Design a protein around this motif. Structure first.
Motif, mmCIF file in Angstrom:
data_model
loop_
_atom_site.group_PDB
_atom_site.id
_atom_site.type_symbol
_atom_site.label_atom_id
_atom_site.label_comp_id
_atom_site.label_asym_id
_atom_site.label_seq_id
_atom_site.Cartn_x
_atom_site.Cartn_y
_atom_site.Cartn_z
ATOM 1 N N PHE A 72 0.900 -1.154 0.222
ATOM 2 C CA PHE A 72 -0.053 0.111 0.037
ATOM 3 C C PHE A 72 0.904 1.382 0.038
ATOM 4 C CE2 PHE A 72 -4.149 -1.588 0.654
ATOM 5 C CZ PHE A 72 -4.123 -2.731 0.733
ATOM 6 N N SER A 76 -7.749 0.867 -6.037
ATOM 7 C CA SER A 76 -8.999 0.271 -5.650
ATOM 8 C C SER A 76 -9.964 0.511 -6.522
ATOM 9 C CB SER A 76 -9.301 0.630 -4.094
ATOM 10 O OG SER A 76 -10.630 0.294 -3.916
ATOM 11 N N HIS A 79 -12.951 2.236 -4.919
ATOM 12 C CA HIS A 79 -12.675 3.525 -4.539
ATOM 13 C C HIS A 79 -12.282 4.459 -5.923
ATOM 14 C CE1 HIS A 79 -12.228 3.479 -0.084
ATOM 15 N NE2 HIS A 79 -12.275 2.199 -0.498
ATOM 16 N N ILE A 83 -5.496 3.871 -2.640
ATOM 17 C CA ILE A 83 -6.040 4.083 -1.100
ATOM 18 C C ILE A 83 -4.768 3.451 -0.200
ATOM 19 C CG2 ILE A 83 -8.453 3.588 -1.594
ATOM 20 C CD1 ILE A 83 -8.346 0.582 -0.426
ATOM 21 N N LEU A 85 -3.423 1.809 3.421
ATOM 22 C CA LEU A 85 -3.801 0.601 4.268
ATOM 23 C C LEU A 85 -4.747 0.989 5.534
ATOM 24 C CD1 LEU A 85 -3.472 -2.312 5.259
ATOM 25 C CD2 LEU A 85 -1.311 -1.909 6.241
ATOM 26 N N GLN A 87 -7.182 2.995 5.041
ATOM 27 C CA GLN A 87 -8.579 2.938 4.437
ATOM 28 C C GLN A 87 -9.062 1.685 4.149
ATOM 29 O OE1 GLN A 87 -7.065 5.734 1.269
ATOM 30 N NE2 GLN A 87 -9.143 6.676 1.553
ATOM 31 N N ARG A 88 -7.789 0.874 3.893
ATOM 32 C CA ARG A 88 -8.187 -0.598 3.507
ATOM 33 C C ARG A 88 -9.018 -1.268 4.751
ATOM 34 N NH1 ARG A 88 -10.532 -4.409 2.269
ATOM 35 N NH2 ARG A 88 -9.891 -6.466 0.948
ATOM 36 N N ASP A 91 -12.257 -0.216 5.258
ATOM 37 C CA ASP A 91 -13.457 -1.084 4.461
ATOM 38 C C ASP A 91 -13.704 -2.514 4.958
ATOM 39 O OD1 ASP A 91 -13.519 0.979 2.680
ATOM 40 O OD2 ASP A 91 -12.037 -0.055 1.242
ATOM 41 N N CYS A 92 -12.908 -3.115 5.609
ATOM 42 C CA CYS A 92 -13.001 -4.186 6.606
ATOM 43 C C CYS A 92 -14.170 -4.245 7.526
ATOM 44 C CB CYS A 92 -11.563 -4.891 6.794
ATOM 45 S SG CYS A 92 -10.404 -5.236 5.415
#
Ligand code: HEC
Ligand code: HEC
Ligand SMILES: O=S([O-])[O-]
Length: 230
Positions: A72, A76, A79, A83, A85, A87-88, A91-92
């Motif tokens: 990262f 994405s 998105h 993005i 990490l 932000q990732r 999302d999770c």
């Protein structure tokens, strides 16, 4: 690619970073109880990102976090742009944990980052670690949910339940997590995609393997059920 190595917990450094790493592990292992304001279902990160010896995210083909930090930022499609990490992970929380993203400077998020960075020690930035991600399994036919139902009863139900609602441990954490229903991942989760669920199941379930056809069909059965809407 480079090899998947898990650092020695006894070689954790004294001080702020070491303490942050230990908190991070706990947030990833025990997420509903540690971050109730941000988690909307019964899942902890470790329920799809398992690890041995109390660690989280250290198993090949179950989306290990070993080496994730050096991958990262990245594009994405979700998105439509690059993005981070942070932000990732958000999302999770929103999808897999049916909840709310932590602020990008939230101390719990930074502790999770510190833990993932620790697991990633020694991995060259940009390098791909062997066993990263959850490899998809795709067959050239529709998943047969009738076959899948039979497979589920024979191979999965003992742990995950007739109603897919899992098995609670004595402390109220899921020993065996819910596969569908209101406490499972929501429709926006990667695990709600047939080829991802089939790949995860193929490589990791039943715990402790299935033919491709069996994994494909039982994934199909699992994904016929209701779960929270994203
Ligand atoms: C029969 C083939 C199945 C299917 C279709 C699934 N499981 Fe399991 N499972 C178990 C535990 C402890 C976990 C957490 C992760 C881990 O520690 O390895 C899981 C996780 C899953 C998932 C992802 C999480 C989710 O809630 O969706 C899925 C999709 C899944 N499983 C499907 C424990 C067990 C067992 C106890 C020994 C048995 C048997 C199975 N699982 C069998 C299956
Ligand atoms: C199953 C319902 C999941 C739960 C609970 C969590 N995650 Fe997850 N995650 C899942 C899948 C299927 C994937 C895709 C893997 C792939 O092949 O790309 C992911 C991916 C991540 C990533 C990116 C990994 C990478 O190699 O790029 C991160 C950083 C991640 N997940 C973090 C994460 C955290 C912190 C969780 C608890 C809040 C979490 N995930 C839960 C499936 C599931
Ligand atoms: O980001 S995942 O949970 O779809």
């Amino acid at each position: 690619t480079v090899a998947l190595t898990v650092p020695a917990a006894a070689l954790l450094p004294d001080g702020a970073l070491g303490e942050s790493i230990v908190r991070g592990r706990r947030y990833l292992s025990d997420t509903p109880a540690q971050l109730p304001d941000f988690v909307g279902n019964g899942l902890a990160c470790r329920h799809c990102h398992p690890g041995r010896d109390g660690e989280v995210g250290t198993e090949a083909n179950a989306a290990p976090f070993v080496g994730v930090v050096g991958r990262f930022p990245q594009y994405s499609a979700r998105h439509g742009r690059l993005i981070t990490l942070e932000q990732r992970i958000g999302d999770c929380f929103e999808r897999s944990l049916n909840g709310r993203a932590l602020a990008l400077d939230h101390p719990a998020l930074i502790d999770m980052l510190a833990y993932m960075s620790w697991l990633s020690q020694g991995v060259p930035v940009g390098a791909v670690v062997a066993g990263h991600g959850i490899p998809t399994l795709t067959l050239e036919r529709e998943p047969d949910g009738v076959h899948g139902e039979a497979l589920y009863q024979a191979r999965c139900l003992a742990c995950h339940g007739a109603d897919g609602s899992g098995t609670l441990d004595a402390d109220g954490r899921y020993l065996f997590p819910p596969l569908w229903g209101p406490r499972s991942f929501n429709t926006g989760a990667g695990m709600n995609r047939q080829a991802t669920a089939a790949g995860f199941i193929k490589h990791k379930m039943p715990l402790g393997s299935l033919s491709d056809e069996e994994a494909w069909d039982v994934a199909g059965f699992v994904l016929t059920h209701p779960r929270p809407l994203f």
